[PDB]
Amino acid sequence: KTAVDSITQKKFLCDRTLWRIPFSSNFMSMGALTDLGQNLLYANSAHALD
Amino acid sequence: KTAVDSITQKKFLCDRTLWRIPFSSNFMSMGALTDLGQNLLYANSAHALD
Amino acid sequence: INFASLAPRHGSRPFMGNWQDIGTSNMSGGAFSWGSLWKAWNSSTGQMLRDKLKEQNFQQK
Amino acid sequence: FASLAPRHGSRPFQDIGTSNMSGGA
Amino acid sequence: SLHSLNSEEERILRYVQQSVSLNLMRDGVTPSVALDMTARNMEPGMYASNRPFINRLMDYLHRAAAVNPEYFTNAILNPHWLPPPGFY
Amino acid sequence: PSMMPQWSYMHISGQDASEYLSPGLVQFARATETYFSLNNKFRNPTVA
């Protein structure tokens, strides 16, 4: 009956696994050599990553 | 008559404006597409800027 | 339609605007031909008169 | 017909002078 | 339309379009040098296997870029394009 | 230079709108400048 006002906190744990961002057009596992990896845009041009 | 010795200070105010450094051979505005912008040394190869 | 008729006619010569009229304006190097013209409480009159200066001020009438 | 002109397209873009103290403008 | 291309040749055509467009658009090179650069970067087995068709396509694109730049740019930039009859 | 497709396609450099437009739309826009301004839509390139 006598319960103070409540504020909700939410958090998660995900241990032992490493997050992954696959270099694929649709984030899938369509192949070991993802299509974006072999796309002609990256075939013969220099790029820099930030 | 009893004026004290003086030291001059100079400064300027320029607001509501942007310092501009046009990418041109002689800093003038001869068009939207600057001459240096379409020059071969910059249109052909790639560069890095600091 | 020759597309001509549709124009205000000012004199038997249908008035058609200049051909080279389509357009560009980005940032620097280009600007237009009609432009910006633009203690307390003591004297008064020159001031009332100047407020009145806020109307058409130049030309290109 | 030099073509050092600033160009507003395929199309490229009087020597004049004179204003004494009095003369119209 | 009595000559129409084999899927392998269509793959080659799309690759040529992509490579030439990429070189011509990001490196600013001339169209002839763009065509030359595309050629080399090809898998040698497929390049030798399809030497005649690739050679003919390269020559056709070369003379098109030399003669009619608008047609060359249109044919190098628009997918769903096919070589017109008489190119054979 | 003399060949860069992206510019010519996006009117960064090339013919002006008085020319590349089909010369019937130019006539129409030229006719109705007074009451229905049309020349503001398209773009014209300026090249130093």
CSV table of C-alpha atoms in Angstrom, one decimal:
chain,number,residue,atom,x,y,z
A,1,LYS,CA,0.0,0.0,0.0
A,2,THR,CA,2.7,2.5,1.0
A,3,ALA,CA,5.0,2.3,-2.0
A,4,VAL,CA,7.0,5.3,-3.0
A,5,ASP,CA,7.0,6.7,-6.4
A,6,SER,CA,8.9,4.6,-8.9
A,7,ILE,CA,11.4,5.4,-11.7
A,8,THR,CA,12.3,2.6,-14.0
A,9,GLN,CA,15.9,1.8,-15.1
A,10,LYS,CA,16.8,-0.5,-18.0
A,11,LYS,CA,20.1,-2.0,-19.0
A,12,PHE,CA,21.4,-5.2,-20.7
A,13,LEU,CA,24.4,-7.5,-20.6
A,14,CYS,CA,26.0,-9.2,-23.5
A,15,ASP,CA,29.2,-10.7,-22.5
A,16,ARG,CA,31.6,-12.9,-24.4
A,17,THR,CA,30.4,-12.0,-27.7
A,18,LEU,CA,31.7,-9.6,-30.1
A,19,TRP,CA,29.5,-7.2,-32.0
A,20,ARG,CA,29.7,-7.5,-35.7
A,21,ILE,CA,29.0,-5.1,-38.6
A,22,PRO,CA,29.2,-7.3,-41.8
A,23,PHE,CA,30.4,-5.4,-44.9
A,24,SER,CA,27.4,-6.5,-46.9
A,25,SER,CA,24.6,-4.8,-48.8
A,26,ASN,CA,21.9,-6.2,-46.6
A,27,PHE,CA,23.7,-7.3,-43.5
A,28,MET,CA,23.5,-11.0,-44.3
A,29,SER,CA,25.8,-14.0,-44.8
A,30,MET,CA,25.2,-14.5,-48.5
A,31,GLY,CA,28.8,-15.6,-48.8
A,32,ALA,CA,32.3,-15.6,-47.3
A,33,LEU,CA,33.3,-13.0,-49.8
A,34,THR,CA,30.6,-10.4,-49.3
A,35,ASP,CA,29.4,-8.8,-52.5
A,36,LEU,CA,30.2,-5.3,-51.3
A,37,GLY,CA,33.8,-6.6,-50.8
A,38,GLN,CA,34.0,-7.4,-54.5
A,39,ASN,CA,32.0,-4.5,-55.8
A,40,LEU,CA,33.8,-2.6,-58.6
A,41,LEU,CA,33.6,0.7,-56.6
A,42,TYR,CA,36.2,-0.7,-54.2
A,43,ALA,CA,38.1,-2.7,-56.8
A,44,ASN,CA,40.6,-0.2,-58.0
A,45,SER,CA,40.3,3.0,-56.0
A,46,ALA,CA,41.8,4.4,-52.8
A,47,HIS,CA,39.6,5.1,-49.8
A,48,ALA,CA,40.1,6.3,-46.3
A,49,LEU,CA,37.9,5.3,-43.3
A,50,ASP,CA,36.8,7.4,-40.3
B,1,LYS,CA,48.1,69.7,-20.4
B,2,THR,CA,48.5,66.9,-17.9
B,3,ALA,CA,47.7,64.1,-20.3
B,4,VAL,CA,49.3,60.8,-19.4
B,5,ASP,CA,51.4,58.8,-21.8
B,6,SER,CA,49.4,56.6,-24.2
B,7,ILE,CA,49.6,53.2,-25.8
B,8,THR,CA,47.5,52.5,-28.8
B,9,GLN,CA,45.3,49.4,-29.3
B,10,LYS,CA,43.7,48.3,-32.6
B,11,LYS,CA,41.1,45.7,-33.3
B,12,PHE,CA,38.2,45.1,-35.7
B,13,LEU,CA,34.7,43.7,-35.6
B,14,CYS,CA,33.3,41.8,-38.6
B,15,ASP,CA,30.2,39.7,-37.7
B,16,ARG,CA,27.3,38.3,-39.8
B,17,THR,CA,29.9,37.2,-42.3
B,18,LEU,CA,32.2,34.4,-43.3
B,19,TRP,CA,35.9,34.6,-44.0
B,20,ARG,CA,36.2,33.4,-47.6
B,21,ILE,CA,39.2,31.8,-49.3
B,22,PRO,CA,38.1,31.1,-52.9
B,23,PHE,CA,39.8,28.2,-54.6
B,24,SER,CA,40.9,30.2,-57.6
B,25,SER,CA,44.1,31.1,-59.3
B,26,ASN,CA,43.8,34.8,-58.5
B,27,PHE,CA,41.1,34.8,-55.8
B,28,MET,CA,38.6,36.4,-58.2
B,29,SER,CA,35.1,35.2,-58.9
B,30,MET,CA,35.0,34.3,-62.6
B,31,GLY,CA,32.2,31.7,-62.2
B,32,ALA,CA,30.8,29.0,-60.1
B,33,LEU,CA,33.2,26.5,-61.5
B,34,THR,CA,36.6,28.0,-60.6
B,35,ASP,CA,39.4,27.6,-63.0
B,36,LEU,CA,41.6,26.0,-60.4
B,37,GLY,CA,38.7,23.6,-59.6
B,38,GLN,CA,38.8,22.1,-63.1
B,39,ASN,CA,42.6,22.3,-63.6
B,40,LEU,CA,44.2,19.1,-64.6
B,41,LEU,CA,46.4,18.7,-61.5
B,42,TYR,CA,43.3,18.7,-59.3
B,43,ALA,CA,40.7,17.1,-61.6
B,44,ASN,CA,42.9,14.1,-62.6
B,45,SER,CA,44.6,12.7,-59.5
B,46,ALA,CA,43.8,12.6,-55.8
B,47,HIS,CA,45.2,14.6,-52.9
B,48,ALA,CA,45.1,15.1,-49.2
B,49,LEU,CA,44.7,18.4,-47.3
B,50,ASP,CA,45.9,19.7,-44.0
C,1,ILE,CA,-1.0,27.2,-80.1
C,2,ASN,CA,2.3,28.8,-81.1
C,3,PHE,CA,2.4,29.4,-77.4
C,4,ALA,CA,2.6,33.0,-78.4
C,5,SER,CA,-0.9,34.1,-78.0
C,6,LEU,CA,-0.8,33.4,-74.4
C,7,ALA,CA,1.1,36.5,-73.8
C,8,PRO,CA,0.3,39.8,-72.6
C,9,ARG,CA,0.1,41.7,-75.8
C,10,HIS,CA,1.3,45.2,-75.5
C,11,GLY,CA,0.7,46.6,-78.8
C,12,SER,CA,0.2,44.0,-81.6
C,13,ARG,CA,3.5,42.6,-80.8
C,14,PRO,CA,3.0,39.9,-78.4
C,15,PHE,CA,5.2,40.8,-75.5
C,16,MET,CA,7.5,37.9,-74.9
C,17,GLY,CA,10.3,38.0,-72.4
C,18,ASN,CA,14.0,37.5,-73.2
C,19,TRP,CA,15.1,34.1,-74.4
C,20,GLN,CA,18.1,33.9,-72.2
C,21,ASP,CA,16.2,33.9,-69.0
C,22,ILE,CA,16.5,30.6,-67.1
C,23,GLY,CA,18.6,30.6,-63.8
C,24,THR,CA,21.5,30.2,-61.3
C,25,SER,CA,22.7,31.7,-58.0
C,26,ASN,CA,24.9,30.0,-55.6
C,27,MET,CA,26.9,31.6,-52.8
C,28,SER,CA,29.8,33.7,-54.2
C,29,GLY,CA,30.4,35.7,-57.4
C,30,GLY,CA,26.8,36.4,-58.4
C,31,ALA,CA,24.4,39.2,-57.1
C,32,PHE,CA,21.2,41.2,-58.3
C,33,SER,CA,20.5,44.7,-59.6
C,34,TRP,CA,18.1,46.0,-57.1
C,35,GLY,CA,19.5,46.6,-53.7
C,36,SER,CA,19.5,47.3,-50.1
C,37,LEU,CA,19.1,50.9,-49.6
C,38,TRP,CA,19.7,49.7,-46.2
C,39,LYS,CA,20.9,59.0,-25.8
C,40,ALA,CA,17.3,59.4,-26.6
C,41,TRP,CA,14.4,61.7,-27.3
C,42,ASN,CA,15.8,65.1,-27.7
C,43,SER,CA,15.6,67.0,-31.0
C,44,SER,CA,12.6,65.1,-32.7
C,45,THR,CA,11.9,66.6,-36.1
C,46,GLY,CA,14.7,65.4,-38.4
C,47,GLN,CA,13.8,62.1,-36.8
C,48,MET,CA,10.2,62.1,-37.7
C,49,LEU,CA,11.2,63.0,-41.2
C,50,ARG,CA,13.7,60.2,-41.5
C,51,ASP,CA,11.3,57.5,-40.4
C,52,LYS,CA,9.3,58.7,-43.5
C,53,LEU,CA,12.2,57.8,-45.6
C,54,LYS,CA,11.2,54.1,-45.4
C,55,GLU,CA,9.4,53.9,-48.9
C,56,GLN,CA,10.6,53.4,-52.4
C,57,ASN,CA,13.9,54.9,-52.3
C,58,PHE,CA,15.8,54.6,-55.5
C,59,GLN,CA,14.7,53.8,-59.1
C,60,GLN,CA,14.1,51.2,-61.7
C,61,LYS,CA,10.7,52.4,-61.8
D,1,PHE,CA,38.2,37.3,-80.7
D,2,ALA,CA,39.8,36.1,-77.5
D,3,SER,CA,38.0,33.4,-75.5
D,4,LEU,CA,39.4,34.1,-72.2
D,5,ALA,CA,35.9,35.1,-71.4
D,6,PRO,CA,34.0,34.2,-68.4
D,7,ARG,CA,31.5,31.7,-69.8
D,8,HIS,CA,27.9,31.4,-68.9
D,9,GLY,CA,27.4,28.5,-71.2
D,10,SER,CA,28.1,27.4,-74.7
D,11,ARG,CA,27.9,31.1,-75.2
D,12,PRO,CA,30.8,33.1,-73.9
D,13,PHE,CA,30.2,36.4,-72.1
D,14,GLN,CA,32.4,49.0,-75.8
D,15,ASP,CA,35.5,50.4,-74.3
D,16,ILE,CA,33.6,53.6,-73.2
D,17,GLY,CA,34.6,56.0,-70.3
D,18,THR,CA,33.7,59.8,-69.7
D,19,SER,CA,32.1,61.9,-67.0
D,20,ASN,CA,33.0,65.4,-66.6
D,21,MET,CA,31.5,67.7,-63.8
D,22,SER,CA,28.5,68.4,-65.8
D,23,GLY,CA,26.9,66.2,-68.4
D,24,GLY,CA,23.6,64.5,-67.7
D,25,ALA,CA,24.4,61.8,-65.1
E,1,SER,CA,17.2,-8.3,-83.8
E,2,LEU,CA,18.9,-11.6,-84.9
E,3,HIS,CA,21.9,-11.5,-82.7
E,4,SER,CA,21.4,-11.1,-78.9
E,5,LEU,CA,24.3,-11.9,-76.5
E,6,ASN,CA,24.9,-14.7,-74.0
E,7,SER,CA,24.5,-14.3,-70.3
E,8,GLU,CA,28.3,-14.4,-69.9
E,9,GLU,CA,28.6,-11.6,-72.5
E,10,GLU,CA,26.0,-9.6,-70.7
E,11,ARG,CA,28.0,-9.9,-67.5
E,12,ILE,CA,31.0,-8.7,-69.4
E,13,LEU,CA,29.0,-5.8,-70.8
E,14,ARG,CA,27.7,-4.7,-67.4
E,15,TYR,CA,31.2,-5.0,-66.0
E,16,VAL,CA,32.6,-2.8,-68.8
E,17,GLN,CA,29.9,-0.3,-68.2
E,18,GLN,CA,30.6,-0.2,-64.5
E,19,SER,CA,34.3,0.1,-64.8
E,20,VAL,CA,34.3,2.7,-67.6
E,21,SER,CA,31.8,4.8,-65.8
E,22,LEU,CA,33.7,4.6,-62.5
E,23,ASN,CA,37.0,5.6,-64.1
E,24,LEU,CA,35.4,8.3,-66.2
E,25,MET,CA,33.5,9.8,-63.2
E,26,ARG,CA,35.9,9.6,-60.3
E,27,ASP,CA,39.3,9.9,-62.0
E,28,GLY,CA,38.4,12.3,-64.7
E,29,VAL,CA,40.5,10.4,-67.3
E,30,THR,CA,39.9,10.6,-71.0
E,31,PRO,CA,37.4,8.1,-72.4
E,32,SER,CA,40.1,6.3,-74.5
E,33,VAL,CA,42.4,5.9,-71.4
E,34,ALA,CA,39.3,4.9,-69.5
E,35,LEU,CA,38.6,2.1,-71.9
E,36,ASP,CA,42.3,1.0,-71.8
E,37,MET,CA,42.3,0.9,-68.0
E,38,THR,CA,39.2,-1.1,-67.9
E,39,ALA,CA,40.6,-3.7,-70.2
E,40,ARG,CA,43.6,-4.5,-68.3
E,41,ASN,CA,41.9,-5.1,-65.0
E,42,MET,CA,40.1,-8.2,-66.4
E,43,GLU,CA,40.5,-11.8,-65.3
E,44,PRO,CA,42.9,-13.2,-67.9
E,45,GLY,CA,41.1,-16.5,-68.4
E,46,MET,CA,37.8,-14.8,-69.3
E,47,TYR,CA,39.6,-12.1,-71.2
E,48,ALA,CA,41.3,-14.7,-73.4
E,49,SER,CA,38.2,-16.8,-73.7
E,50,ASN,CA,36.1,-13.9,-74.9
E,51,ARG,CA,38.8,-12.1,-76.8
E,52,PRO,CA,36.8,-11.5,-80.0
E,53,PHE,CA,33.6,-10.1,-78.4
E,54,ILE,CA,35.5,-8.0,-75.9
E,55,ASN,CA,37.8,-6.6,-78.7
E,56,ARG,CA,34.8,-5.7,-80.9
E,57,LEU,CA,33.0,-4.1,-78.0
E,58,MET,CA,36.1,-2.0,-77.1
E,59,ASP,CA,36.6,-0.9,-80.7
E,60,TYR,CA,32.9,0.0,-81.0
E,61,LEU,CA,33.0,2.1,-77.8
E,62,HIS,CA,36.2,3.7,-78.9
E,63,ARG,CA,34.9,4.9,-82.2
E,64,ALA,CA,31.6,5.9,-80.5
E,65,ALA,CA,33.4,8.0,-78.0
E,66,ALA,CA,35.5,9.5,-80.7
E,67,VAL,CA,32.6,10.4,-83.0
E,68,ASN,CA,29.4,10.9,-80.9
E,69,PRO,CA,30.1,11.8,-77.3
E,70,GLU,CA,26.5,12.1,-76.3
E,71,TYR,CA,25.7,8.6,-77.6
E,72,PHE,CA,28.8,7.2,-75.9
E,73,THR,CA,27.9,8.8,-72.6
E,74,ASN,CA,24.3,7.6,-72.8
E,75,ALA,CA,25.4,4.0,-73.7
E,76,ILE,CA,28.0,3.9,-71.0
E,77,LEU,CA,25.7,5.3,-68.2
E,78,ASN,CA,22.2,3.7,-68.9
E,79,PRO,CA,21.6,0.1,-67.8
E,80,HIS,CA,19.1,-1.9,-69.9
E,81,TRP,CA,21.1,-0.7,-72.9
E,82,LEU,CA,22.0,-3.2,-75.6
E,83,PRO,CA,24.3,-2.9,-78.6
E,84,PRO,CA,22.2,-1.9,-81.6
E,85,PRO,CA,21.8,-4.2,-84.6
E,86,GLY,CA,24.6,-3.5,-87.2
E,87,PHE,CA,27.2,-3.6,-84.4
E,88,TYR,CA,27.4,-7.3,-85.4
F,1,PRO,CA,38.4,19.3,-69.4
F,2,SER,CA,36.2,18.1,-72.4
F,3,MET,CA,34.7,15.0,-70.9
F,4,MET,CA,33.2,14.5,-67.4
F,5,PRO,CA,29.8,13.0,-67.6
F,6,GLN,CA,28.5,13.8,-64.1
F,7,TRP,CA,28.9,17.6,-64.7
F,8,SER,CA,27.2,17.6,-68.1
F,9,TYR,CA,24.3,15.5,-66.7
F,10,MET,CA,23.8,17.7,-63.7
F,11,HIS,CA,24.3,21.0,-65.6
F,12,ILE,CA,27.4,21.8,-63.6
F,13,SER,CA,29.1,22.5,-66.9
F,14,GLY,CA,27.5,22.3,-70.4
F,15,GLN,CA,24.8,24.0,-72.4
F,16,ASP,CA,22.4,26.5,-70.8
F,17,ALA,CA,18.8,26.0,-70.1
F,18,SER,CA,18.0,28.2,-73.1
F,19,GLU,CA,19.5,25.5,-75.3
F,20,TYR,CA,19.2,22.0,-73.8
F,21,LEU,CA,15.5,22.3,-73.1
F,22,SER,CA,13.3,21.1,-75.9
F,23,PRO,CA,12.7,24.2,-77.9
F,24,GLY,CA,9.0,24.1,-77.3
F,25,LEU,CA,9.2,24.5,-73.6
F,26,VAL,CA,11.6,27.4,-74.1
F,27,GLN,CA,8.9,29.0,-76.2
F,28,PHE,CA,6.2,28.4,-73.5
F,29,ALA,CA,8.3,29.7,-70.6
F,30,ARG,CA,9.4,32.7,-72.7
F,31,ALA,CA,5.7,33.5,-73.5
F,32,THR,CA,4.4,33.4,-69.9
F,33,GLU,CA,7.2,35.2,-68.0
F,34,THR,CA,4.8,37.9,-66.9
F,35,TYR,CA,2.2,35.9,-64.9
F,36,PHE,CA,3.6,32.3,-64.5
F,37,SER,CA,7.3,32.5,-63.8
F,38,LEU,CA,9.0,29.4,-65.1
F,39,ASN,CA,12.7,30.4,-65.6
F,40,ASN,CA,13.4,30.0,-61.9
F,41,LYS,CA,13.0,26.2,-61.9
F,42,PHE,CA,15.8,25.0,-64.2
F,43,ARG,CA,19.5,25.7,-63.9
F,44,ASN,CA,22.3,27.3,-66.0
F,45,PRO,CA,26.0,26.5,-65.7
F,46,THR,CA,28.7,29.2,-65.2
F,47,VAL,CA,32.3,28.2,-66.0
F,48,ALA,CA,35.4,30.2,-65.4
